[PDB]
Amino acid sequence: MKEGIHPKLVPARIICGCGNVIETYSTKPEIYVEVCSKCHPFYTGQQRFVDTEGRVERFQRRYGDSYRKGR
Amino acid sequence: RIKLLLECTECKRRNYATEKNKRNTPNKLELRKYCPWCRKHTVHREVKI
Amino acid sequence: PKHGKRYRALLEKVDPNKIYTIDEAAHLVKELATAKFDETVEVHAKLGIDPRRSDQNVRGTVSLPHGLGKQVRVLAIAKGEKIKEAEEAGADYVGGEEIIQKILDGWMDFDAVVATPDVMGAVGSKLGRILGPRGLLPNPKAGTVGFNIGEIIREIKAGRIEFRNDKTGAIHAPVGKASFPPEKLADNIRAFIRALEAHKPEGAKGTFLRSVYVTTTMGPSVRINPHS
RNA sequence: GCCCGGAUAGCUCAGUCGGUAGAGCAGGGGAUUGAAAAUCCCCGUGUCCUUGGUUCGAUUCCGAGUCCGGGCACCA
RNA sequence: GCGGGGGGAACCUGGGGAACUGAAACAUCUCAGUACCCAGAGGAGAGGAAAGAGAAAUCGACUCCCUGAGUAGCGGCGAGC
RNA sequence: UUGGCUCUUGGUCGCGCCUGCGUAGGAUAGGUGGGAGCCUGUGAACCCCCGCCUCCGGGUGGGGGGGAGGCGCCGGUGAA
RNA sequence: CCUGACUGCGAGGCCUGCAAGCCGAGCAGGGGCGAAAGCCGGGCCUAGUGAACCGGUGGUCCCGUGUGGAAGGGCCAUCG
The residue ranges of every structural domain in chain C are: 15-66+160-228, 67-159
C103 close to C192: Cβ distance less than 8 angstroms:
no
Strands C43-47 and A36-38: unpaired
Q: Is the CB of C135 under 7 A from strand F?
A: yes
Task: Please tell me which chains touch A, using 3 or more CB pairs under 8 Å as the contact test.
Answer: none
Q: Residues C107-111: contacts with CB within 8 Å, 24+ apart?
A: C109/C73, C110/C73, C110/C74, C110/C75, C111/C72, C111/C73, C111/C74
Q: Rounded distance, CA C53 to CA C32, Å?
A: 38
Q: C101: helix, coil or strand?
A: helix
Length of chain A: 71
Looking at the DSSP bridge assignments, the partners of residue B18 are B9
Please tell me whether A69 is known to bind a ligand: no
The C-alpha angle C49, C207, C163, rounded to 5 degrees, equals 55
Q: Which CATH superfamily is domain C15-66+160-228 in?
A: Ribosomal protein L1/L10, rRNA-binding domain (3.30.190.20)
Rounded CA-CA distance A30/A14 in Å is 19
Residue A18 assigned as binding residue: yes
Q: What's the angle, vertex CA C75, arms to CA C150 and CA C66, rounded to 5?
A: 50
Cα–Cα dist C152/C123, whole Å = 18
For strand G, the positions having any atom within 7 A of a protein Cβ are 2-7, 29-31, 54-56, 58-60, 72, 77-80
Please check whether residue A7 is in contact with residue A63, taking contact to mean a CB–CB distance below 8 angstroms.
Answer: yes
- In Å, what is the separation between the CA of C99 and the C1' of G65? 76
* Helix residue ranges, H only, C132-179: 149-156
Q: Which CATH number fits domain C67-159: 3.30.1510.10, 3.30.413.10, 3.40.630.40, 3.40.50.790?
A: 3.40.50.790
Residues C158 and C92: their CA atoms lie apart, in Å, by: 12
Alpha carbons B15 and A70: distance in angstroms, whole number: 74
Secondary structure of residue C61 in the 3-state scheme: strand
Which of these, C26, C62, C24, lies nearest to C42 by C-alpha position? Answer: C26
What does the alpha-carbon distance between residue C228 and residue C216 come to, in Å, rounded to a whole number? 21
Burial level of C144, CB count in 10 A (0-12/13-18/19+)?
Answer: buried
C167 Cβ neighbours under 8 A, 6+ residues apart? C51, C52
> C17: helix, coil or strand?
coil
C219 touches strand F (CB under 7 A): yes
Which long-range contacts (C-beta less than 8 Å, at least 24 apart) are formed by C80-83? C82/C116, C82/C147, C82/C149, C82/C150
φ, ψ dihedrals at C225, nearest 5°: -80, 125
Q: Is C10 helix (H, G, I), strand (E, B) or coil?
A: helix
Q: Does A33 belong to an annotated binding site?
A: no
Q: Is B27 left (phi over 0), alpha (psi -120 to 50) or beta?
A: left
User: Cα–Cα distance between C219 and C20 in angstroms, integer?
Assistant: 20
Bases of strand E lying below 7 A from some protein CB = 15-19, 27-29, 76
For C33-183, list the strands marked E by DSSP. 43-47, 74-77, 112-115, 171-173
> Could you tell me the CA-to-CA distances from A12 to A9, A15, A32, A34 in Å, in that order?
10, 11, 22, 16
How far does the CA of B21 sit from the C1' of G44, in Å? 22
CA of A30, C1' of F72: distance in angstroms: 78
Consult the annotation and say whether A16 binds a ligand: yes
Report CA torsion sign: C47, C50, C56, C60.
positive
Element (H, E) at C184: helix C182-198
User: Does nucleic acid strand F have an atom less than 7 angstroms from the CB of C170?
Assistant: yes
